[PDB]
Amino acid sequence: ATTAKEEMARFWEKNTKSSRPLSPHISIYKWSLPMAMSITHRGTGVALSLGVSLFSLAALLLPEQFPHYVAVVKSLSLSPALIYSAKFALVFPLSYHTWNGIRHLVWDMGKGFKLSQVEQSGVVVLILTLLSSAAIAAM
Amino acid sequence: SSKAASLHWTSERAVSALLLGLLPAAYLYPGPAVDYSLAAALTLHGHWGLGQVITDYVHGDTPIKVANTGLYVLSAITFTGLCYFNYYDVGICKAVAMLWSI
Amino acid sequence: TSRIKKFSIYRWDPDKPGDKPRMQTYEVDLNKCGPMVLDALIKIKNELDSTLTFRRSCREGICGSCAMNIAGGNTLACTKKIDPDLSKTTKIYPLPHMYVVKDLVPDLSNFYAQYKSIEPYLKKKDESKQGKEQYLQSIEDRQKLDGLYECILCACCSTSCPSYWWNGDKYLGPAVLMQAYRWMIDSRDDYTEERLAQLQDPFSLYRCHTIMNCTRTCPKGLNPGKAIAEIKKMMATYKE
Amino acid sequence: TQYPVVDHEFDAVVVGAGGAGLRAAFGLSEAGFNTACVTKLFPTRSHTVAAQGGINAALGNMEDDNWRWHFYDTVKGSDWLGDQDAIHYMTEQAPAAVIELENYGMPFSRTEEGKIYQRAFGGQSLQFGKGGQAHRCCCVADRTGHSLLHTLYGRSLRYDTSYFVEYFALDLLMENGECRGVIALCIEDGTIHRFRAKNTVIATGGYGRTYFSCTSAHTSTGDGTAMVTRAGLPCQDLEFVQFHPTGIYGAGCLITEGCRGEGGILINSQGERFMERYAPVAKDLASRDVVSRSMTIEIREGRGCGPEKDHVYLQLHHLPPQQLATRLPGISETAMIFAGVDVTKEPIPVLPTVHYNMGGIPTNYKGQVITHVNGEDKVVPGLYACGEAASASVHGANRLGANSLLDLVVFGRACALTIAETCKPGEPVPSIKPNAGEESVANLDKLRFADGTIRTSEARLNMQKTMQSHAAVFRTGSILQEGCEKLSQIYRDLAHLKTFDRGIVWNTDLVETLELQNLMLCALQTIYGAEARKESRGAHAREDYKLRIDEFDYSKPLQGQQKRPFEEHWRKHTLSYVDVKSGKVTLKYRPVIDRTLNEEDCSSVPPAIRSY
Numbered sequence A: 001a002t003t004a005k006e007e008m009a010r011f012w013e014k015n016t017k018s019s020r021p022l023s024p025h026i027s028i029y030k031w032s033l034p035m036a037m038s039i040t041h042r043g044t045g046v047a048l049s050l051g052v053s054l055f056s057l058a059a060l061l062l063p064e065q066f067p068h069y070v071a072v073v074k075s076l077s078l079s080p081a082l083i084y085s086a087k088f089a090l091v092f093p094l095s096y097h098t099w100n101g102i103r104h105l106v107w108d109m110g111k112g113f114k115l116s117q118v119e120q121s122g123v124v125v126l127i128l129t130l131l132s133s134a135a136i137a138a139m
Numbered sequence B: 001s002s003k004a005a006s007l008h009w010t011s012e013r014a015v016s017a018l019l020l021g022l023l024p025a026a027y028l029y030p031g032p033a034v035d036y037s038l039a040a041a042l043t044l045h046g047h048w049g050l051g052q053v054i055t056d057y058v059h060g061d062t063p064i065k066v067a068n069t070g071l072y073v074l075s076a077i078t079f080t081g082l083c084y085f086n087y088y089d090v091g092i093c094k095a096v097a098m099l100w101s102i
Numbered sequence C: 001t002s003r004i005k006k007f008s009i010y011r012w013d014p015d016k017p018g019d020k021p022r023m024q025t026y027e028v029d030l031n032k033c034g035p036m037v038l039d040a041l042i043k044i045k046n047e048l049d050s051t052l053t054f055r056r057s058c059r060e061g062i063c064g065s066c067a068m069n070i071a072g073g074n075t076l077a078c079t080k081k082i083d084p085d086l087s088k089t090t091k092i093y094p095l096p097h098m099y100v101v102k103d104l105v106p107d108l109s110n111f112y113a114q115y116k117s118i119e120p121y122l123k124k125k126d127e128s129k130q131g132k133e134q135y136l137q138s139i140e141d142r143q144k145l146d147g148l149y150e151c152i153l154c155a156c157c158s159t160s161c162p163s164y165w166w167n168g169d170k171y172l173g174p175a176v177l178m179q180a181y182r183w184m185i186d187s188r189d190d191y192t193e194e195r196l197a198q199l200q201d202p203f204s205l206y207r208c209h210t211i212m213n214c215t216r217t218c219p220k221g222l223n224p225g226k227a228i229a230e231i232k233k234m235m236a237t238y239k240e
Numbered sequence D: 001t002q003y004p005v006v007d008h009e010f011d012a013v014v015v016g017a018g019g020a021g022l023r024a025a026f027g028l029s030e031a032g033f034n035t036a037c038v039t040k041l042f043p044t045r046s047h048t049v050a051a052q053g054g055i056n057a058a059l060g061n062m063e064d065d066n067w068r069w070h071f072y073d074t075v076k077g078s079d080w081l082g083d084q085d086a087i088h089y090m091t092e093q094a095p096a097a098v099i100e101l102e103n104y105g106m107p108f109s110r111t112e113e114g115k116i117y118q119r120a121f122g123g124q125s126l127q128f129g130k131g132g133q134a135h136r137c138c139c140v141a142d143r144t145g146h147s148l149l150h151t152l153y154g155r156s157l158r159y160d161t162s163y164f165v166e167y168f169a170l171d172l173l174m175e176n177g178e179c180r181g182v183i184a185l186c187i188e189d190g191t192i193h194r195f196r197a198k199n200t201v202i203a204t205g206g207y208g209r210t211y212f213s214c215t216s217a218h219t220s221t222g223d224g225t226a227m228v229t230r231a232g233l234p235c236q237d238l239e240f241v242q243f244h245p246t247g248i249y250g251a252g253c254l255i256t257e258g259c260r261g262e263g264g265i266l267i268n269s270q271g272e273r274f275m276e277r278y279a280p281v282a283k284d285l286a287s288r289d290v291v292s293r294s295m296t297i298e299i300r301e302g303r304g305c306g307p308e309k310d311h312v313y314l315q316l317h318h319l320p321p322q323q324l325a326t327r328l329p330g331i332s333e334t335a336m337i338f339a340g341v342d343v344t345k346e347p348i349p350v351l352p353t354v355h356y357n358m359g360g361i362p363t364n365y366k367g368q369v370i371t372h373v374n375g376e377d378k379v380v381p382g383l384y385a386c387g388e389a390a391s392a393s394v395h396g397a398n399r400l401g402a403n404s405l406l407d408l409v410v411f412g413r414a415c416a417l418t419i420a421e422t423c424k425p426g427e428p429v430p431s432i433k434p435n436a437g438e439e440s441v442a443n444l445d446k447l448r449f450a451d452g453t454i455r456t457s458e459a460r461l462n463m464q465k466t467m468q469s470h471a472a473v474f475r476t477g478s479i480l481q482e483g484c485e486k487l488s489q490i491y492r493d494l495a496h497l498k499t500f501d502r503g504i505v506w507n508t509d510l511v512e513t514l515e516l517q518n519l520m521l522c523a524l525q526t527i528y529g530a531e532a533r534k535e536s537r538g539a540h541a542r543e544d545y546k547l548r549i550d551e552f553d554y555s556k557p558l559q560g561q562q563k564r565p566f567e568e569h570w571r572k573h574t575l576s577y578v579d580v581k582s583g584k585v586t587l588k589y590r591p592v593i594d595r596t597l598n599e600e601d602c603s604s605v606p607p608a609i610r611s612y
């Protein structure tokens, strides 16, 4: 005698006004590698978008152009190890998000959905992320 | 029309694949065509991506409209600045090569 | 010769005014108990604390009553082997991100209402011959239902999906979505297009970001994550 | 008073949401009746969801069949204690009932022709028991009850049935021999509810939890049959408890009889297929009462299996692995979880286990509850029953496999059809008294604050071990009498009950205490009727009365025989009454209905020797 939408409205009606607690979730659930790689894909994605936006704002507000700031950094004569670490930190989120994005596109085709295949594809993404980042940073 | 949800999902995957194809194109054929293509792909892919984050974590009629309105402003200024950099400066493909030559 | 195993169980009493949730520790001798976690819960209730409240029935993993979070993961207490390592204490919580009725008993009314919204029954255009003759279905068309019809509606998968935590009011969840897919590919159903058009909104289906907590935690070995992806493929290819 | 009482008014009320309860529920709503379905569990949690084997129907999908052959199998299977008019109705409606389930969306297994797959089962044959093994058990692999219940629950969502999930029915509202409705407790908020209706349907399942080792769920506590006992009405044939042959060792989980229907066999310590010696024709597919007694003798003589020699093996590894994964995928996972056995290499340890209750609330073939006064049956107005909680009786002294799921939907629909042809929707709801059901609340409040010497779990275990050791497969007079004096002592010891949870919201301590009162009332009538019945019929085997006592000696030509008086033979239903205050059991008897619904269409089967 109650439709599904009426039952949903009654659910939130009597639960939000009651004294019932909300059972814990994020602070108690056991983590896994595919789960930890899901939030990392979102974290790198947002970090890359905020980096493009900051670079876009710098082009509109900085008094100098891009070739000037390159010479400023090149004149400081930084150590090759520090230059390698800076290049690695910039290419790592792009590399991880790119490979795991390909991993998402394969999923969108309906392939590799077995739990053991999900673990294999995730490990493949991790090693390709390290190899691609280390090679590009070594240039 | 009546399939607005599925068409938006398909357009997201198409832009992701397009943006994926621009990465080797920027290294093999750097130039203005790839510079402005990256400007359009990075803005659209990032705008739709941050919209999914807002849809998941922002709730309430007023907070949703405020977050989505600010995302349009953020994406509009982002695409405008990238197009400014490609026309008045060295462009995206050249800026990366200059940064890696440090 | 006792092998004491420690269990820390979520507790809350609604009849106690001002009662706050807490974790109570119990000691159970595994030599005088069954091999499953539900056997330990029943032993605690019968001997140590009759106030401990939880759902149970079939004790064989077919009814789906005893769904709870054991050792950090959602599973069935009647099929979850007790960890014999006496050095660590097993933590038992209710299904995550659910309004707690009492102790380990969550409120599944919204989960049930979502399963009703997809109309989980056979629908035909010419239903005037209901109950006359058996419908025909090949063995191959019947094999397509394997891995889908075995769902026991325990909600272990949906209560493990983070998207269902934040948007449970409008996101159907992997359990309901896979059953919606179970009726989409049933060769006897004639409303495949109408069931797809129901999910033409930003929340009902497209809150799934392929986190795959659902398939990992399913006690029936099913793959609700894969079924959601097959729905998405159908959503982008069907014509009106 | 202290408990807020909420009154409801409906045309009909259905207590139970299993296979039988759901079919009766939306069947009444389909007929236009404002119907309420009261259930202490969510519908898909009911024990029907655990059914594996299948559901019988003479569809003729594997070979040429006839429902009258299925009629003969059930009558012979019941050992001529079942009512042949109810058996006629069930077996004739069987094809239309299964077709209705498939048309609902039930994912039956399929053949090369696209029709419902059917397997063999125990005690079924062709040509009135002369044409070989029959194959009429329609199944969904080995998850038939799981899919049957989920299909019925999905179908019920299309009608305006007012559901009341997780409500515990306490007693019936009786007035002047008529049922006015039910009274129940809402487990969520702890409020008392009175459901007023012109008709009431009881589909609360069996009471397998009266024993220590059973295949039934923890919620199969016979709550509806206890309400009938507290209303002063009798129960029928409660001493006939079916022991399923193959229950897994230890946890008691059921291994489906379909294993033996696909090619599975039983072996003892010497690897002998011993069923070829007990049943040379039926082999491992004999009736359950015969197979269970055969397994018990092999164990107690000294040919058991395992380290304790207390069970036997169920061999399945000789069958192709593809058939094991397609036909029996459910038990393959269960045998690995609850035994660590791979069915493709090693056999499953099994033993007879309490499974099904043949007895229940006596009804006619229409579902109407009946009483027996002065040698005649009287339909109790406004009270119906269907499913395992009822006694049609289609099963008699021994139920055939896959006949219960048929019972559920056939007689669940019969209740809705009988009410639709008797009453009209919207008729005036029968008024009650301003204090109706006050003794139900007084009992609940007494148990809620009980602070005695014996806790509820301590008293339940004493009942289960008493039934397990005194009313087992083989019974005798001295042991049955010793169990009667124990249960009566245990029932008196219920005044020393002690509960700890003083809350009212989801007080499972209080709920399981109410179920103990229900289990004890069922246990008393079961063992007292078993001690009184001095014969051997079906699942009731008396080692001191090893013969079947009918009105005639049917092992010889009846020409020139003297008919035994009704008080001197035992071919009759046992009717039990209990004074709930003291616990004394009173027993009476009624004759078995031998007529069918149409002699020209279906001939009545006279009693004869029963062999497999």
Ligand SMILES: *Cc1cc2c(cc1C)nc1c(=O)[nH]c(=O)nc-1n2C[C@H](O)[C@H](O)[C@H](O)COP(=O)(O)OP(=O)(O)OC[C@H]1O[C@@H](n2cnc3c(N)ncnc32)[C@H](O)[C@@H]1O
Residues within 6 Å of the ligand: D015, D016, D017, D018, D019, D020, D021, D038, D039, D040, D041, D042, D043, D046, D047, D048, D049, D050, D051, D052, D053, D054, D055, D144, D145, D167, D168, D169, D170, D203, D204, D205, D206, D215, D216, D217, D220, D223, D224, D254, D355, D356, D386, D387, D388, D389, D401, D402, D403, D404, D405, D406, D408
């Ligand atoms: C135990 C079992 C039985 C079984 C089987 C396998 C197992 C493990 N396999 C079968 C098979 O393959 N073929 C077959 O024909 N039968 C098989 N069976 C037997 C059969 O499944 C049962 O006899 C049958 O399913 C019983 O169904 P019914 O609808 O009669 O009852 P239920 O499904 O057990 O559910 C009872 C309902 O009653 C409600 N209830 C109980 N007490 C109360 C109170 N106090 N208040 C309100 N409601 C109550 C329950 O909620 C439940 O829904």
Ligand SMILES: CCCCCCCCCCCO[C@@H]1O[C@H](CO)[C@@H](O[C@H]2O[C@H](CO)[C@@H](O)[C@H](O)[C@H]2O)[C@H](O)[C@H]1O
Residues within 6 Å of the ligand: A031, A032, A033, A034, A036, A037, A040
């Ligand atoms: C920059 C990006 C970095 C991404 C990774 C960050 C670090 C994440 C660390 C989280 C690892 O979390 C760990 O994952 C593994 C593999 O899924 C889990 O193991 C899981 O699968 C294995 C293998 O089938 C099982 O043996 C085990 O019972 C199960 O829990 C483990 O229980 C979890 O504790």
Ligand SMILES: O=C(CC(=O)C(F)(F)F)c1cccs1
Residues within 6 Å of the ligand: A026, A035, A038, A039, A040, A042, B056, C162, C163, C209, C211
């Ligand atoms: O919403 C989350 C993450 C999340 O809740 C968890 F971190 F898992 F809790 C995500 C959405 C898409 C990828 S992760």
Ligand SMILES: O=C([O-])CC(=O)C(=O)O
Residues within 6 Å of the ligand: D051, D052, D053, D054, D254, D255, D256, D257, D258, D356, D400, D401, D402, D403, D404, D405
């Ligand atoms: O009770 C029945 O009808 C048969 C049964 O449980 C089985 O063995 O599958």
Ligand code: SF4
Residues within 6 Å of the ligand: C064, C150, C151, C152, C153, C154, C155, C156, C157, C158, C174, C175, C178, C217, C218, C219, C220, C221, C222, C224
């Ligand atoms: S899918 Fe697996 S987990 Fe989610 S409900 Fe159905 S069975 Fe329980």
Ligand code: F3S
Residues within 6 Å of the ligand: C157, C160, C161, C162, C163, C164, C173, C174, C207, C208, C209, C210, C211, C212, C213, C214, C215, C224, C225, C226, C228
């Ligand atoms: S757990 Fe969650 S978001 Fe997608 S695939 Fe599984 S549902």
Ligand code: FES
Residues within 6 Å of the ligand: C055, C056, C057, C058, C059, C060, C061, C062, C063, C064, C065, C066, C067, C076, C077, C078, C079
């Ligand atoms: S009790 Fe039925 S699933 Fe655990």
Ligand SMILES: [K+]
Residues within 6 Å of the ligand: D357, D358, D359, D360, D387, D388, D389, D390, D391
């Ligand atoms: K019965």
Ligand SMILES: [Mg+2]
Residues within 6 Å of the ligand: D492, D493
């Ligand atoms: Mg005393």
